[PDB]
Amino acid sequence: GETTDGVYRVMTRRLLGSTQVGVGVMQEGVFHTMWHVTKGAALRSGEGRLDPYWGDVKQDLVSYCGPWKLDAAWDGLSEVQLLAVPPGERAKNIQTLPGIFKTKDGDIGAVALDYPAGTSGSPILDKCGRVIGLYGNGVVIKNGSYVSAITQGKRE
């Protein structure tokens, strides 16, 4: 299968036609996505198979072929870019200044951008092109708008 670093769509043929259920990041030979996109199922890349290696429902993250590799963090000050990969549409960069999710266990960056559910797992990047987290686990606020956490894993 294709192992080149980059952003990938996660598709299924179980439903009508070919449906995009999410997105992920290939980096250092490991595939990174959100848990709710694959529910921990194995994936296919051409004729090759990617088996889950680590996952956690609460963090809503999963890695395939190896441990979570992404460790960059939002600096708390700068604008970032969502590299949105919407279903049936070309990858597109959207720049934004993150807001904050304040929790009893600390603050997390959050991006107020509304994309289809199938865009979950799209990477959020800093100005160096490093992935600071994945888009797709968040909340619907008063006005009906979607705000995603910037969800990042731990590199062991």
Binding site: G6, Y8, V10, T38, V57, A110
Partner: protein
């Protein structure tokens, strides 16, 4: 049966479209990985 397809490189685009606001929200995260608003 799920499969992946390459969609692009991961790079910062100079002069990309700039949008979105920056809300500061109080939230809670449950054991199922669901975020909710704290009011």
């Amino acid at each position: 049966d799920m499969y992946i397809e390459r969609a692009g490189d991961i790079t910062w685009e100079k002069d990309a479209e700039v949008t979105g606001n920056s809300p500061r929200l109080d939230v809670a995260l449950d054991e199922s990985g669901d975020f909710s608003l704290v009011e």
